[PDB]
Amino acid sequence: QERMNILQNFQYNDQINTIFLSKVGDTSIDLPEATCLIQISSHYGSRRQEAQRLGRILRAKRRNDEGFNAFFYSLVSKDTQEMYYSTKRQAFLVDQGYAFKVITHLHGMENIPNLAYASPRERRELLQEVLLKNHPLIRKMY
């Protein structure tokens, strides 16, 4: 019941323009209004999950207006095992024909007023927080 209300609000209520899906919404949920797509975490090397997640924005409402181009961002940590999983879980889309654009720098990111964990104090606090994660009558008696 709660998720249906959330989905309807996001679909028809302009206030909720962004949501945070999970593995449950990885496939078979139709969002005709979705145009942009982002992914933070991943289920290791599965190339199928990559295609299913992309499908949420492939059925956007305005898929015929001039110059329409949906966006799919894949944030991945450099020098980690994520590159092994990223290049391994995106080998199917390349076969289809999709081409990923490498974004080494995002223009205008520094001029945003406030950014989370901008100071070392917050980074240290977060580091410790995440690190610490790991006789039927007798019945009356009783």
Binding site: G67, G97, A99, K101, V102
Partner: protein, 445 residues
């Protein structure tokens, strides 16, 4: 940079030696052709008239629009000393070199030529069957040796010595092998005309004590000769050079008469496609080429997988790119080869992509990229991976008694451009090994 490279060499020649180079009309006819069109116009005017013309008269000929060209033409003409500036009676008179003037007049007027163009025996031979195959194979044999692909016959020591002594095809005895360098890949990229000049230009510099003038009288005279014709026998130094030129696939000898080759005439002036290939997002290569040259060059930075009679198919891999990069090939050169050797189908779709990009938003003119942008980025990214670790050699300076001394020595290194790192808080800095001696000497003084 064809004429520029040849012209640059001619400038370093002393004026006393340049005068001797103008004695033979054969060389003059070629040196006349290399100048800019405007320069050639003025030279032809002064050659036949025995008078002195002020430079102001020359300026009158050129329109205001072509004033800039008149500066390059006069500068280039004066650099070669072909135009002699004489100042007298308050006017900067202009005259041509008498030897160059006389040499040009003799050739154009059909006068005595001192056999600068050679002689004819009338013993023509078949060129396509033998000359084309011989020189193409001989020029291909050196390329296969350059590319590193196996081939039974190896080039003679004369050219091999030149290659090692030249920056081209760096070699090491300890390694026991020959590999191409950054300029070597550029050499392979240059057209046949420039591809021949580079080896010849290196040959000009290699030769020492064979006179410098004699070598030029022969090379320039070679272009004058016409393929498929006989020429009797020439200078003594030219005889060994003629045999030397036979090793470069320039002149063919039956064993009294020498026959120039197609490459000889190609040296003077210039003159689906073979070598065209398609690049997919899967890093696959499909070359519509049937020729060892295209196949051999592609294998430098491509992991070939299979081939057909009409086309060759392969796949780009990190290992193949890493092997190419280890040889000194820059990613910019690789993309240039792909862009300049793109299939027409890629160009047409790429043109459509530009048209579509401009059709949607004609305000901006995005660059015409034939191949998908991802390939360029990934290739550049692979280059960044090799440049990840950066290491220098030198000495670290520390334990400074006073900050002033630390700043003085560190500032001195920065001035001479040998400082690599410094830290005011720790009073330490690092300098390159090259500047170590200079810094130490300054420290003592």
């Amino acid at each position: 940079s064809l004429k520029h490279s040849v012209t640059q060499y001619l400038e370093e020649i002393p004026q006393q030696v340049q005068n001797r180079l103008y004695t033979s009309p054969a060389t003059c006819l070629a040196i006349y052709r290399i100048l800019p069109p405007l320069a050639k116009f003025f030279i032809m005017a002064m050659v036949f008239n025995e008078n002195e013309v002020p430079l102001l008269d020359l300026d009158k000929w050129v329109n205001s629009n072509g004033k800039l060209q008149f500066q390059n033409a006069i500068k280039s003409m004066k650099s070669l000393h072909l135009l002699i500036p004489n100042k007298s009676s308050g006017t900067l008179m202009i005259n041509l070199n008498p030897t160059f003037k006389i040499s040009l007049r003799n050739a154009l007027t059909g006068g005595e030529v001192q056999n600068s163009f050679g002689v004819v025996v009338e013993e023509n031979v078949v060129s396509l069957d033998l000359l084309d195959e011989y020189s193409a194979n001989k020029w291909e044999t050196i390329l296969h040796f350059m590319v590193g692909t196996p081939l039974a016959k190896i080039p003679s020591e004369k050219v091999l010595n030149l290659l090692k002594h030249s920056k081209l095809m760096e070699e090491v005895n300890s390694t026991g092998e020959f590999k191409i360098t950054n300029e070597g890949f550029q050499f392979l990229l240059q057209e046949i005309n420039s591809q021949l000049w580079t080896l010849l230009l290196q040959y000009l510099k290699m030769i020492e004590t064979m006179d410098l003038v004699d070598v030029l009288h022969f090379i320039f005279m070679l272009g004058a000769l016409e393929v498929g014709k006989a020429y009797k026998i020439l200078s003594e130094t030219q005889r060994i050079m003629l045999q030397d030129m036979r090793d470069y696939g320039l002149v063919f000898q039956k064993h009294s008469i020498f026959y120039p080759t197609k490459l000889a005439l190609m040296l003077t002036s210039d003159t689906i496609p073979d070598g065209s290939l398609i690049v997919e997002t899967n890093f696959k290569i499909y070359s519509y080429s049937n020729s060892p040259l295209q196949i051999a060059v592609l294998s430098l930075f491509v992991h070939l997988k299979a081939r057909f009679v009409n086309m060759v198919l392969g796949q780009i891999t990190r290992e193949s790119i890493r092997r190419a990069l280890t040889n000194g090939i820059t990613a910019d050169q690789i993309i240039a080869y792909l862009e300049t050797h793109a299939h027409p189908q890629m160009r047409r779709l790429a043109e459509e992509k530009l048209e579509k990009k401009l059709e949607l938003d004609p305000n901006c003119k995005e660059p015409l990229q034939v191949l998908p942008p991802t390939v360029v980025d990934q290739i550049r990214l692979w280059q960044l991976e090799l440049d990840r670790v950066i290491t220098y050699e030198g000495s670290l300076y520390s334990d400074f008694e006073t900050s002033q001394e630390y700043n003085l020595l560190s500032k001195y290194a920065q001035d001479i451009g040998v400082l690599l790192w410094k830290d005011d808080k720790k009073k330490k800095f690092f300098i390159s090994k090259e500047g170590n001696s200079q810094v130490l000497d300054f420290a003592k003084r």
